[PDB]
Structures are given as structure tokens and as C-alpha cells.
Symmetry: C3
Subunit: 495 residues, 3 copies
């Protein structure tokens, strides 16, 4: 019932890179068509972008958006999505068994990222294409002018280069369900050679090597080791993907899965440092966690849609509707991301609009709304800039059906120096027993105490109203005392 945590400014983990509050838009389902892009809608601007969605994205303070995939990119031909729209083909999207009409391509999606105050992180097709097509796309986007592909961008109506900073070398290609599956050795080579050439066009870019499609793949983490062995000198990040689900309907074990996330991350870091010692390099590889979220609700509808009604434009795929308990895990996942901010410098919640997303528009042009997971992310991105202090914590333990010694209270604190504030994120993942956390600030004024709680752990949000929303609700010597209700998300700020 008690839990003691001592924060101290002097005990840093690292500065937060803001790109860990990024997200991800794939040409999948209604992410784009009847998603952020709805040409005649009364709620859209003259370019067809839903303005209410733009506003909801800006509320999440997303600085970087992965695009356009995802499994989609591994058979995408980028030239299909630029130039006059009347001349753009329709294409089969093999990954998601849909027709892609290519109304949104590089230039429309870059315009959209301007409107939501975000940058693109661009993925290139290394499934069915290779080096020279990555070079062309990079020249098109980043070279000012005076060459075949920069002048082509100019002739398409974009005089200034997009100057995309981070590029991703394909998508995860270790699974037998993706077009252009590669062995680790094949992918290591194409990534090394694509990376080599791209850095010769634009040496200021950063590059992401793709890790395994999940930690459960038998080739994890040898895949990461092999790719980094080949490409180390030319890439800056390795990517990780992780999704969690609660089909077993075990909310106690569900919220313990953040422990598996912590272990996955350290595994990837050890793998990077193993290859570091092997190359005798002084460079550190950072982590790009460019696919993470809860994902399990829509699994069976998606299987129906493929292949019952295949080859639709914008079929409603991956439309997970999230519960309060899902928001609790998304919050736990964010706490775990923060705790490893010394190595994780990029992360993308997957995905942003409609597809397993914090932001939903109702089908056929309907209204936009916030899912339960919208709010833990909004809080983390708003108050979680600054310096991650080392959580030194003793907290009660519990076991679940499949995890052991699960921390009762997961927590981290982030000192914003320019603002003299200190924000403490804490989840009580004791489903039953309320707990108090006593926090010895030895720093270094109790601003507020925002909470995400609800009676019903399976409650949902909808276009008819949010049942889950930040209750701006609930310190005086040096020790801060606030109470963590069972199954709750807590944002405690100090000034």
C-alpha cells in the first residue's frame, strides 16, 4: 500500500529527444482515404485535408511521422504518387489486398505534415526495388534543383526540397507474409549498399536499419546483429516493433507486459553494443521504435475483409476500438520508452489516423473523435520534454498468471529545466489495490495532478462521447505524497 520513490536532479538518465513522440501513417485502411484525406468534405480544407483531424494531431504534439509504410512500402513505386493526379495509376496493394489510387503521394503528404507541425520520416522500397530507386527518391526530395529528379519535383509544383532528415531502409522483411521477404544476409547487404549511396547524395540525413518484425521471430536478435555488422558505419538507428493484446482477457497480466517491453529494449541495446565492440567503433547506434501500440481488437474483421471483399479502396482495416485498460498499457509503454531515452531517440505510435489509432473518423465522412489511448500519449508528449531522471524505486510486487514480481507502481520523472517544472508519470497497475506513492524530491510548487481513471476497465470511447478523459483532479516539505488509485494513470507536476 506504500511505495517510495526518490527523485534527484543530479541523477539523470538522458535528455528526451522529442522524436520519441512521433507516429506513423501507412497507406492502409482508412488512414488516408476517408481518413486524413477527404476531398469534398465540409470539414476539409481546399486541398482535401480534414481540418478537425489536423487539430487533433496537433494536440498530440507529434514532431515526426513515419511514412508510407509499413508492409505497404515494400511493393510501392513512389513515382506512382507524384505528378499530375490524372496520370497516376491505380495499383494493387499486395500487403493489404486493396486498390491504391495514389491520390496522396509524397508531395500531398508533405503538405499535410506542414499543417500538423510534423516532419516526415520516409521509408524506401527495398522489397521489390533497391539502390537506384532509393537514390532517385532522395534526390527528388532533398536535392535543391538542377538534376533530373530535383527538377522533376520542381516541375511537380514544389520548388523547395522537402529536406527529409531521417530515412528508413525498407520495412521489416523477415516475415513470410511480406512482399520481398529477405534473409538477414540479403537484407544486410542491400541496406548497407543503399545506405552507402544515399549518404553520398545527402550526407546530412540519418538512416534507420530495420530490425526484426517482432521479438518473437526466431531470427531475432541475430537479424539485428547481422544488419548492423554489414551496415554499421552508414546507419544511425536500428528499428524495433512491438504490439500487445489482451485476447486472454487477463487485465492483470496485460498490464505486466510493459516488463517484456523493457526486456526487449535492453536486448536490442546489448546487440548494438556487441556489434559496437566488434567494429571497435566509437559511434553508438540508437533505437528507432517506429512501430508500437496495443493491437488485437479488430483481428477477425480484418481477416474477413481479406479475402472476402478484396481490392477495395480504403476498406476499414485494423479499426481497433480501445478500452480504458488499453490506455493503461499505452501509458505503461510510454513510461518504458521514457526510461530508455538514453538510447531510444525515435518512436512512432502505430498508427495515427483510424488504423489502430488514437484518432478516429467515422466512416463515409463522419466526425472525428479521440480514443482512450489518445490521452496518455497527449500527456507524455506535452509534459515529457526535458531530462529523464533515474527512477530509484521500491514498490510492492505482485505475480500474474504469466509474469512474476511485476512492479505494482511503474513510474518515471522528467525535469524540465527551462520551465522549473518536474513531471512525474506513474501508473498503478495493481488492478485491485489502491496505493500511495511517497516521492522524496531531493532537488529542488505542486502544480496539479491530472488522472486517467475509470470504474470500468473495458469501457470504450466513441463518436458519441468520451468516457475516458483527463480528470484534472486530486506535497509540502520536500516529500510529495499523492495517491495512485487502482488501475490509474497519473501526471503529477511540481513547480
Amino acid at each position: 500500500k506504500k511505495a517510495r520513490m526518490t527523485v534527484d536532479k543530479d541523477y539523470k538518465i538522458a535528455e528526451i529527444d522529442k522524436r520519441i513522440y512521433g507516429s506513423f501513417v501507412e497507406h492502409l485502411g482508412r488512414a488516408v482515404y476517408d481518413g486524413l484525406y477527404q476531398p469534398g468534405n465540409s470539414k476539409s480544407d481546399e486541398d482535401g485535408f480534414r481540418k478537425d483531424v489536423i487539430e487533433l494531431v496537433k494536440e498530440l504534439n507529434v514532431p515526426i511521422i513515419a511514412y508510407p509504410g509499413g508492409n505497404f512500402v515494400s511493393n510501392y513505386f513512389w513515382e506512382d504518387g507524384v505528378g499530375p493526379v490524372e496520370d497516376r495509376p491505380r495499383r494493387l496493394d499486395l500487403a493489404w489486398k486493396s486498390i491504391e489510387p495514389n491520390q496522396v503521394g509524397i508531395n500531398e503528404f508533405a503538405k499535410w505534415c506542414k499543417k500538423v507541425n510534423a516532419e516526415i520520416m520516409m521509408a524506401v522500397n527495398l522489397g521489390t526495388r533497391g539502390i537506384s530507386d532509393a537514390c532517385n527518391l532522395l534526390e527528388y526530395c532533398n536535392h535543391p534543383g538542377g538534376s533530373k529528379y530535383s527538377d522533376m519535383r520542381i516541375k511537380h509544383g514544389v520548388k523547395e526540397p522537402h529536406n527529409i532528415k531521417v530515412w528508413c531502409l525498407g520495412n521489416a522483411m523477415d516475415g513470410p507474409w511480406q512482399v520481398g521477404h529477405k534473409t538477414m544476409d540479403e537484407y544486410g547487404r542491400i541496406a548497407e549498399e543503399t545506405a552507402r549511396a544515399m549518404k553520398m547524395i545527402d550526407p546530412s540525413i540519418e538512416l534507420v536499419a530495420c530490425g526484426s518484425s517482432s521479438k518473437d521471430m526466431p531470427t531475432f536478435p541475430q537479424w539485428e546483429a547481422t544488419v548492423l555488422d554489414y551496415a554499421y558505419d552508414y546507419v544511425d538507428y536500428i528499428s524495433l516493433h512491438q504490439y500487445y493484446g489482451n485476447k486472454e482477457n487477463d487485465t492483470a497480466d496485460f498490464l505486466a507486459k510493459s516488463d517484456d517491453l523493457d526486456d526487449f529494449i535492453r536486448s536490442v541495446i546489448a546487440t548494438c553494443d556487441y556489434i559496437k565492440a566488434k567494429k571497435r567503433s566509437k559511434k553508438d547506434i540508437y533505437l528507432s521504435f517506429d512501430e508500437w501500440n496495443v493491437w488485437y481488437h479488430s483481428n477477425n474483421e480484418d481477416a474477413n475483409i481479406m479475402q472476402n471483399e478484396p481490392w477495395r479502396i480504403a476498406p476499414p482495416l485494423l479499426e481497433d476500438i480501445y478500452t480504458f485498460e488499453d490506455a493503461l498499457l499505452v501509458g505503461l509503454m510510454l513510461i518504458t520508452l521514457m526510461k530508455h531515452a538514453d538510447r531510444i531517440k525515435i518512436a512512432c505510435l502505430a498508427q495515427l489516423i483510424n488504423v489502430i489509432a488514437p484518432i478516429v473518423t467515422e466512416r463515409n465522412g463522419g466526425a472525428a473523435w479521440r480514443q482512450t489511448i489518445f490521452y496518455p500519449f497527449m500527456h507524455a508528449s506535452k509534459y515529457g520534454r526535458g531530462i529523464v531522471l533515474q527512477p530509484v524505486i521500491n514498490s510492492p510486487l505482485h505475480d500474474t498468471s504469466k509474469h512474476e514480481d511485476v512492479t505494482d507502481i511503474e513510474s518515471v520523472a522528467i525535469y524540465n529545466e527551462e520551465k522549473e517544472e518536474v513531471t512525474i508519470f506513474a501508473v498503478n497497475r495493481n488492478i485491485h489495490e489502491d496505493i500511495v506513492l511517497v516521492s522524496d524530491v531531493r532537488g529542488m510548487r505542486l502544480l496539479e495532478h491530472i488522472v486517467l481513471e475509470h470504474q470500468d476497465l473495458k469501457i470504450r470511447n466513441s463518436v458519441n462521447g468520451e468516457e475516458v478523459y483527463p480528470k484534472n483532479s486530486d506535497f509540502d516539505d520536500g516529500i510529495l505524497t499523492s495517491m495512485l488509485r487502482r488501475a490509474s494513470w497519473n501526471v503529477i507536476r511540481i513547480g
Copy 2:
């Protein structure tokens, strides 16, 4: 003089897949140009197809035709053969040192297949092209509309999709004489990935993985093992190729060669089942015998042509003129195919027109006529539909120069119970002795004994007449007693 055999509808082998009576047209020599396609000719229809050639193919009841190669496909660019004929290029055909004019492409050959009531088995180029080109060709042929390459087919004048059922992942590429020669691991990888992508576009197709170019390559049968190991989950067949020759002028040892055919088939079946165990699959790989024939007569003239008269259109290559003994061995090969109809589901006489073919057009628009090998195939395709019955047979044996204990009488019975007939196929390949076949027919009337025989084992057919052709030449109890002339082919039907 005496050989005995028990026929019994309870010792089934398998139901015959009629696709074992298939054939093969490659863009080679006079197969197409000055072959089935002759636009000026008086005997040609509105599309330029020779109508007498069309009639002869239908007499063979060929249900499936492989196209368009062959070594030719390994450097073929299928876009060169579709669209307005005025804009189609002339290409160098490296395999056969010829100019391909591309007057006949997929759409013309598909129309021709309709007129001979056959359908296409399409090979894709995995020599100099790869995944995305195979996907484009499949989309073009099988996707109905609303996408780049399907709409391209429609605009080219073919509104409905061809819906090609069986595709071949390349041609054999183990030979140093083939453009795009692959190692077995290289071919396995590209076959695996091409098949994976193709089945995402059209999951109803079947795919054929290529075997060794012959049983005599050092990489047979490890090539088959390796390809199947990579691609097992996505393919349905493995291909086999076999040609026999009588360059040594030894008819006895020549006719013994279907024994090595049987052994060859067993070797490939064992290879498939070894991999099935390795995979723990419940699927059996079936065999596609998409190249088999006698071929040796024209070998020296083809050296002359490729080496000194290169880059012609329609050079007269591979124009074997077949003898009566060649027809006997073709019959022995058809019997062996029938004996393995449990695993062999597709087979292709290589080839259908002019090129090592049962059908010949003279040259420079001359008349069409039937080679000796035409009639064993016509008999087998006409009456060999139904259930292959296990041959329990005790026959005299003989030695030849290079074969030991060769059975004198080779035989199988097919039981068509929807017509209530039992057709016995038998060859006496003892050339020096006549032999009586006592056939115990555990019942279940004789309707005819049909023969191909001749005194002159080297006699040929020609445009001036057929010397080898079906003769109606000649059981009461339940015991079928049939006299099998030395070096003869026999089709004895009971009902």
C-alpha cells in the same frame, strides 16, 4: 512367347489428370512464325492462324499448352508482345540466335489456345527479370480491371481476364548455355519470393517450380531439393525434363529407355517426399513433366544454323523427322507417365508445332502433316482418360547393350467407368519376337485392337504420305488373349 497380366479395378493407381496430355509451344524456329501463325496463307483464318494446323491440334485433345518457353522465356520481355503490333519491337533472342519479331504475343497466343480448345500454362522470366515483372504479367492476365496492368489489357483489346491457372516460375536455369543461369540457392530464393507475391495477387493460381534441366546435370537432384526447401509452401509442382535419342543406332537399347524414365520419375518423387518430411507439410508436391519427347535427329543442322546463319526470323531449328521406332518409344513414355499418374498431374509433349513436334508444316507455307509420334500421343490422349489400374504383370525379359532385365511387354490399363470401357496400352519392345499377352480381367466384350506396326523400324511419315498410322488390325471368356506383334504399339479396348 507368353506373358501374363492381371487387370482388376480394385488395384487402382490414380485418376488421370487430363493435363498430362498437354504440350508446349516455344518462340523457337518455325513453331509460331511459318508454323501455327502464317498471315498471308490461303489455309489461314482471319487472325493469321493456319486452320489445318488448328484441326490437327484438336485431334490430339491437348488441354493445356506451355508458353512461351523454354530457354526463350529467360530473356523475354512480355510487354514487347502486347499492344499495337506497329509499336512492338524486334528483339534479339539470345537462346536461339534469332530475331523475335513479337507479332505473336500473349493475347494472340491466348486466342489461338481458345481455337484449339486448350489453355495456357504461362512461364515468367526469372532469368533477366524478377518479382515485380511476374506480378505485372499476372495482374495483366488475371486481374479483372480497375488497376494499371489489368486496364492495360482491356485497352489492348481483351476485355475479360485470361485467368491463367498454372504459372511456371521461370525455366530451367542450371545450364551454362542459358542466359540468366542461377545457382540452386539463387533460383530457390527468387522462386520463393516470386511465388509468395504472385499468390497475393491471385491465390487461385497454381505454381510450378523448375527442376534441373535434365537428370544428367551434376546438380540434379539437389537442385530440386533446394528449390522445394525454399519455396515449398507456395508452389504446387516441380518440373522434370527428359529427352531420349537413338544416335547409337540400337533399337533394342533405345526402347529400353523408358526404364530410366521410370527411375527418373521415382528419384524426383523421393526428393519431393524428403522435403515434405523436412517441412512437416501435409501437402504433396505433384510433378509437372513439361518437357518430354524423342529428340536427336536434327542435332547437327541446328549447330550449323545457330553458329553461322544467326539472327534470322524463323530459322528451321529442331526439325526432327521421326521414325517408326521413335513412335514406339514415345508410346513407352506415355505408358510410364500413366503408371505415375498419382504424382504426375501435368505433362507436356515438347513441342507441338514443327519444333520436335508431332505436327509439321512444310516450310514457306506448305501443307501440314502428321509425324509418326503423332499417333501414340493421339491414342493415349483419346482413350487414356479414367483410372490407372495397377499393372500386375509377368513378362519375358531381355538384355540390351546397356540395359539388363528389360521387360518385353510394357503395359497399363485405364478404366473409364463413365463409358464402361477398359483400354489396355501395350508395347512389345522385343523387336525380334512376337509375344502373346494373356490378360486376366477380373470383371467387369472386346470392341477393337488398334496397332501401330511396320516392318521398317526407320520409316518416316512425310507431306507425301503417312507410312505409320493406326491400323484396325486384330477374348471371349473373362481372359483377354491378345497377340502383340514384335516392335508394335497396341491399344486394346474392352467394354
Copy 3:
């Protein structure tokens, strides 16, 4: 003081293939643009070709020129350089951080080679491209007509096929500074299948497989053995690359480096013979030394030009200005090449115009002069055609900072039978002592003794004048030719 040589016309090494006097033009720096190709210029002809440069090349009697690279070729798309010039794109040259405007492509460069009496040895892109693109280029260039790419050539205004004889399968691709870098097994496989398919289009061409970037690469010589293992039956040559520098500023050691060249050539020959025994083949692979020169003066200015000033048309890259001691090592390398004429059949001075070149044009459109290295190459190419006789030399030796037992004199005799000339090429690389060379022409009138010498080993040529240029002599009565060879000199002594 005394070195003795025995020249017998019956002790032969081999007939000299004149393609050992080849050179090389890459789309690099000012080789093409502001070099051989200058449209506006008063010195330029109807095609835009500097006529003064054309005549300078013709004096070197260069029979074959490799083109278009070099690193450049490894990401070159040849179609960008043919067809109407108004429709040719500008492209990023990742190798040299330049813009390639493609005003000179294969058909302009083929015309230029006609004007200097040379042929192209063409390199195909095996970096980012492969089999089918090499087939297309070979058909465009060598197939008469009646097919897609041969007719395309005709449509572009070249009715006759170029009929290019020697093709180079990519460029060396073992280095991490190269677009499309390959492991030895990757390159082995791609070279094998490119070669196989190309020889089906035109069986009369000859093919060069690429060796390592230099002997110093860790994968040398295993790269050469693997590529030859794969492609042996389909290729005719293996390539070698060698450059030398004098950044340590040690003239004696510098001039000893032809000894390393000799060791390098033998190592590659052994490698060929190893694979030959492995293949039980009756065919020897021949050597193509298609990059060799002195190269070091311009390294630092080159590093500055990328970055700081990247993506220019025609940046002034690799503009080494050669000293007299550089010309001596160039002469020593040509002597070494001559001594291995039985296996080296193609060699390429890298490069011909402005880019580490014997011929310079001064930048922004004039005026064109000859570097110090121009002249040993001119002598070797003009008088070094015939039979390499076997060098029997008793030369005094000397040690240097990093080399031992270095001959003071390097010499080789080339017997021309259609002229009754013998030519003795000799270098005295003892920087300190004149040496008399006694040649016993067990033969068989002294025709001349040409000399390249100077008091300043660091003196350079320039547009303002040649400081280094040929002179006579100093200076044969029985069957005994005696000739004093100066301190640090290049010597061409001719008999008739």
C-alpha cells in the same frame, strides 16, 4: 659506375601488344568538360572538340581508350547520354560529387576516338545495373540493325555499329567508397552471367573481369581468384590498378616502386595460373593494366572540393602537376609493363586529359600543354613496338629507406623487324651517380640516344613552357654499344 647488358634478338619474351600503350578517359573533373570537349572555343572543331588536344593525343599514338570509368560507370545510365541532346537529363555523379550534364555520351566519345585514331574499351555499369542493361548497350553498339537497340543507334544518327572490341565488366567494386560495392562472390556471379549473355549477342568481343582496387586491399588476391573461378570460361582478361606517390618526399625510394609493380604483376599471374590449373583449362587469362599512373599531388585540394563545393559541372579534380622525378617513375613503370608483355596485353595510363594526365588544358578555355609524364609515354609508344627481348643485365644495386637490392639501371630492348630498329629504353634511378651501360648487341649502327634529364627533380612543366622535354644524347662500334646514362635519367637509345 658500369652496368652491362646483353641484347640478343633470339632470346625473346613476347611480341608487344600495342594496347599496352592505351589510356583512359573518365567523366571526371575536367577530362571531358573544360577538357577534350569545349563547344564555344576558338580551338574547337565542328563537334566541340579541342583541336589542339586532339593533336596532342595523336602524338602519344594511343590505340585504345577506356571509357566512361572508373568509379563513374558504377552508377551511370548509358541511355542518358544518347539521343537528342536537348532531352538528355542532368544526373548526380555520386562518385565525384559533380553534376554530369551528359552532353558527351557514347556517340560523341566514339566520334572523338575516331579523330585521335583510338578505339573504345567500354565499361558497363555493374554497380546499380546488370545483365540486361549490359546486353542493351552491347546491342546498341555492335549489332548492325534490325533490332530494338541497334535501330535506336541508327535513329540517333550512327548508321554503322561502333563494333567495340573490348568490354570491361563493371569497375573494381571492392572498396567501401564505391557505389554498388560488391563482395567477391557477388561480383564473381554478376560478371559471370553478364559475360555469358554478352557473348551470346556478339561472340567476337573480348571481356575484362575486374580485379581488386589495389594490391593493398585485404581481399587481394582472393578477389581475383574468386572472380576468375566463376567467370573463367567467359572472360579474357583480369584487370590491375596501381598508383604511386611521393608524399614522403624520398626520391630514391620513390623510384624503387617499379619493383613493387613487378611483384604485383607476378602475383596476379600466379593467381591466373592457379585458377587455370583448377579449371584444367588450355586458355591463359591475360592481364589488362587499365589504371596506372603517379597520383598524389592533388589529394588535399580534391578533399576540399567535396564537400564545400559539391555538385558542380566540371570541378577541377585530380589535377596533379607532375615533376621530373614523377616522369622517371612513369618511365620505370612502362619498362616494367614492357618486360611483362607476354601476359599484359592491355594497359591504360590513367588518365589522358587534365585528370592525372600527360595533357592539360588550363581551365575556362585554353591553352593546352604537356606534363613531364607526357614524354616517356610518347617515347615508349612510338619506339616500343616489336618484340620484347629478354633483359640480361648486370646492374649495380643500392638500398633505399624501404627497399633493398634495387637495380641502378632498368632497361629493356624492343626489336622491330619491319624497321631493323632496336630500341633500348633505360632508366638510371641512382639519383647520385652517372653510370655507363655496356650493351652487347649479339646481333647485328647507332641511330640516336634520346634523353630526359634535369637538375631539379622537382621541376614541373606548365602552360608557360616545358622545362622537361627530350634532348640528345651522350652517346656503338663493334657489336658493343656503350652509353653513359646520367644521374636520374630516362634514356631511349636506338640502333639501325
